[PDB]
Symmetry: D3
């Protein structure tokens, strides 16, 4: 029974959006699981097998309990019954309290396409008559949040990651093939100082909240607050 | 040093919007102060002196520490330097961590006009060179929230008031002149089952959050969450 | 030639959203038809054959002229040419002046997925070269409205159902398997005082309009008003 | 007791926004009153005394029952207690069922400033303890609508003016000083084919509604529909 | 290497939305290419072979360099991997600096469905490991804009077409089967003075910008301005 | 006749929002004028006379033609006829093609209050019968833009300041009293690494546009584009 299951379309998605928060939860001794929907086979730099090892190292840096690999097609995350059913299996295995996924307002259509699949799977996961591949039992996720990969939007709320900013940067630097030019690298939006741009965003969200660094999140579900109203 | 200072234009505003939350905070042994900007001299039912006693009884039912009465004019809450300065004095006296005020989307223009004054006063309160009537020192409010009086909008978040719904209803029933027809009452939107309409709204916000009753709030300032992300 | 064709994903959708309005139109001697897109085979409580009989009784209580059953899959309302074509047949059979369907902002993705299919079918229905299963002639729907099932949003307009609130509640209570716990019932959002929550919403929309109860609707198409501008 | 009281900042405002609708209501034997808040003393073309006669002729063309002239300052429609009180007098004299005023999204700030004053006056008009200049009794307006002068926005609804488009154009052509260049005219946005631009807008709103010409309106208050839902 | 590739679902889409702009760019000696995604086989008036000749003549009037015909199904522009791949081929052939496509807020669902396909294809076109039908090389489009067919919305910006309004009207009048009733014509929204409605819209957008005629556009991508900030 | 007149509430406002753009325009040999509405007498750090000298040095670093000082009260920018008239004088003196002012979505209410005054003054400036203090002639501003001081919002467009980022940072560092702690400094939001936060924002807007640094702007007026559509 995971506290947190974080979905990305591609390994590095979850780290860019919420690596600071993952590291924060692990230090609170929460069980955090990461699921990549695809093997990122169409990424311009690296290979599928190199990418899997970079992703395994990023998960170890943050202290994620397990890294789950689905094999939905890169640039093929079209709404389908079969794609939803595979994701329902992952939710019903992990039984998470909270699911995180990418925010759909993003230059990469896979990020929005992934969110649409995960939303369908969250609902289907809670229906006992809906049968998944492994015929597992219904599970109702309590909290559903959206993190930002490429976007800089005004978030619904932020989480202070002032104490895990270095761990986030280490988890991103594990993806050498994506962010660090090599002899055989091609220029992408990721090879042009991308990690410093993510730091800049987390710095601006920090400012709105009066801390050094924060990650932004959206919720479609109603937020219910208690301790965080007065924060005392 | 109050935990909470809740502003209304008229006594009964704070009770309608957040009486459940006030009662909840008092039971957590928070210091809660209420300030009415006007004496509600233009209210169709009752009188200024009757209204003050109803308001004092409503505050006792919820356990509010003190009830502060300003004398800005009913239906005269026009943006003015003098009106802002009087409100700055109240903020600098109470030194609250959190300020609540009415949400501006409301059929009663005084609710929006009150919010505009309180927003100006929150900013001016934190400027040491800004001199108030009693020449008090700068105070920076940490949290600023908006409660709903007449509106039913989708809120930024809710607070569970399942355990203080009865105390809220008692604080509202203290305003007999406003909600209960008498021999000499005139028909207003308030004399036509208004308390049951407030209960209905708190019931629907409860449903979105999976509890019996909740009050809705807005924040213009960025929300920073911690314990309430996973709620464990 | 129906005055009204109301689509739901599942039987009970149309009753929750607009049962009061259906009853109102029938009493005005309008011809009202209801179409359920699925047999609701994945509903946690009841069975397909029990659900069909509950739905037939709900239609009789409101006085709907006919209840049409399609067999699109529950939790399988993916955008497809074949699903649109089956719905085009229903529109071209009933030749309705006004079509109602669910509002897409709803925790149940089937409600939004149903609306997307019905919107495509409304457009295709009016193209004579578009051939449906029964090769029927083009029909142009005049009015297209959206009703709310799970949501409480600010609607584009409301309809007074003060005189049909009891008929609505009777049509909902016909779905015993959905709303009334039994020995063999599982807990769902519907088995936990759901009908009283629908009444609460219709009560709050009533208040905005100055009546006891009203149902809320959206229109994407431009509203053209005449008698209702002054209502005299 | 007027059916309709239409406020403008300047004479010609009401005609540009809703001259077609005024003519339509008069033909339905509704009592329509027009109030100009200012004498338009800062208009670049014409004079105050010429403008009053053009306005009187425009009112006769549409068949408005009476034309009421206030003397609030042109480009001086700042929120003030005194300006609101003068407008409350006009509402309490006319006792209108419906009030129309300019939509605030308009290049001319007086249009938005007028709407803000009229909104305050509508609320104060319904409070019996609020005393106006002539100490008249409380009146509650039922319907409150906003018409467009300079803007082309997506309206909440439209009214078919196909049968009163010529009467509207005649009422606008009565303002010769505003729309028709003379020897002593200066170039303004109004002297450069403005009437044909208003016709173009009413033609596009017609198209959305499937008629020749329509005027667009907004409502902040909830719309309650009945006959206009099916329009039969 | 085209300066401009303009996508429509149906021939006449690009002309309605941006015929004035196409004519303007051609006169600036830009290379402009037009791609129709479908043969418009379900259009109520005309035939596929007549429509192709009307489209070829419209392209000659505007001076478009080439007109590209895909054969995706009319009313069958469902999101699919195969439909995206065919559009990727067109982008990789033309290597355009700027892509235009329909704005999704439109009574015709094909316009929105076309935009969704073209957006996916723009992203996939720039991925070298994504293989199209003709295995062409990656191309990154710089500018992506949306034009309006049936809608009248507030655009992100306009382009002055005062000097190409007549060329636009000629390109539209080449579609005789669509806009001009014949002995064998059926009534559609297009056969009822549609070209004059497009002129009216371009006239109103002109007014906002202080010119005779302008076409409106949206951009999801950030606009970067330079010369057009001061326009000197 | 200025190309650009940039209004701030306080000296440093224009530099924070658009110092890069000011420096860019001056290098294009545009005439740029800056007007501060107040002397910033309530600023927590420094004095009025020190602030004026810092402001004069910031203007020299950017190469602004003249720096105009009004004496409206700090935290007293209430809508008034007298405040508007003083600003009309500045517009009619400078006869600018483009006016810049603060965006109203900002934690400092003076920024929004300044924008409201400048908007009223832009309109009144173009009315010849509106008499300013120095009875100057009507001037119609062509372009009106809004820059961001404290906010990080999604802008309508950006301007590349990659080549003037160092000049902007120098103009900000001229305000030593505001940004650099001294023996007698008090902690404010400005004394806590504020210049690096402005650089971070300009870096993120750069990324959206594919350059190193950009400043974001809003326009209420319609944007008309020409060269910047294709940027060739
Ligand atoms: Na939410
Ligand atoms: Na917020
Ligand atoms: Na609509
Ligand atoms: Na409304
Ligand atoms: Na954009
Ligand atoms: Na604009
Ligand atoms: Zn990704
Ligand atoms: Zn009140
Ligand atoms: Zn349903
Ligand atoms: Zn006017
Ligand atoms: Zn088309
Ligand atoms: Zn400032």
């Amino acid at each position: 029974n995971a506290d947190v299951l974080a979905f990305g379309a591609h390994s590095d998605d979850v780290e860019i959006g919420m690596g600071g928060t993952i590291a924060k939860f692990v230090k609170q001794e929460k069980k955090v699981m990461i699921c990549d929907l695809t093997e990122a086979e169409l990424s311009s730099n690296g290979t599928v097998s190199l990418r899997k090892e970079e992703a395994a190292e990023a998960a170890r840096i943050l202290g994620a309990d397990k890294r789950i690999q689905l094999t939905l097609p890169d640039r093929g995350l079209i709404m389908s019954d079969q794609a939803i059913r595979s994701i329902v299996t992952v939710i019903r295995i992990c039984r998470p309290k909270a699911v995180f996924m990418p925010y759909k307002k993003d230059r990469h259509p896979d990020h929005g396409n992934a969110a649409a699949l995960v939303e369908e799977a969250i609902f289907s996961a809670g229906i006992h008559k809906y049968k998944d591949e492994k015929s597992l039992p219904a599970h109702k996720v309590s909290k559903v949040y959206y993190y930002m990969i490429n976007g800089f939007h005004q978030p619904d709320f932020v989480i202070d990651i002032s104490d895990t900013i270095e761990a986030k940067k280490r988890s991103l630097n594990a993806y050498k093939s994506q962010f660090i030019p090599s002899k055989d690298s091609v220029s992408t939006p990721l090879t042009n100082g991308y990690i410093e741009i993510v730091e800049a965003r987390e710095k601006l969200y920090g400012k709105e909240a009066g801390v050094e660094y924060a990650e932004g999140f959206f919720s479609k579900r109603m937020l219910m607050l208690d301790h965080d109203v007065l924060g005392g």
